């Protein structure tokens with residue numbers, strides 16, 4: 366009976382195994398755009414993905430992760446609110462059963478169809494497992510997806526999903542360029558928060574881009590054909606793998622733009 370996204374083990378149940386679910390800096394949150402403060406001391410983001418080395422794509426039973434070689438400074442995030450260098454380890458998405466829901470963050474209570482998380486860890490802590498135990502251990506770049514035109518840079522991901530339909534399946538996934546998932550603008554909101562799946566550790570500096578990317582209805586429909594279950598177990602479509610917004614508590618969201 367472990368955590369997931371069904372009726373009996375969904376986000377409202379996670380606090381029984383992970384009491385930090387009711388903590389002081391949980392994610393995601395609603396971004397109230399009129400209450401976020403411009404922070405003119407906020408530097409531009411530096412997204413350095415030209416030497417990124419993707420390795421593999423994995424269905425882990427809650428989402429799929431595209432994993433990267435993070436044993437060297439090959440794909441790094443710097444700047445913005447960050448001190449130091451954060452290395453890309455994986456990206457994944459959250460999405461809905463319908464186009465009207467799927468994002469974890471919301472913007473003035475608006476839900477997007479999906480949300481991309483590019484997860485990075487602070488190299489001063491040496492590895493990901495040490496970084497998640499530190500208040501500044503991770504930096505996650507969040508990008509909203511809306512349905513409209515296709516995103517050409519996503520299609521290589523879409524096309525391998527058939528090979529990782531069920532939990533525990535992986536496939537080689539080299540030479541994928543994550544720069545093809547970024548919008549034109551790097552304007553962002555930032556706040557301190559948490560992982561949005563268990564163990565829900567409060568180790569994340571969130572950087573949420575204001576501009577969404579647009580994917581086609583056919584692209585998101587292929588996400589919804591994945592399965593939460595393992596092969597030869599009853600089929601349960603992988604949809605609605607998003608945590609809803611959590612209370613902001615004693616936090617201020619800052620904006621890089623006015």
Ligand SMILES: [Zn+2]
Nearest residue numbers: 457459482561
């Ligand atoms: Zn995520």
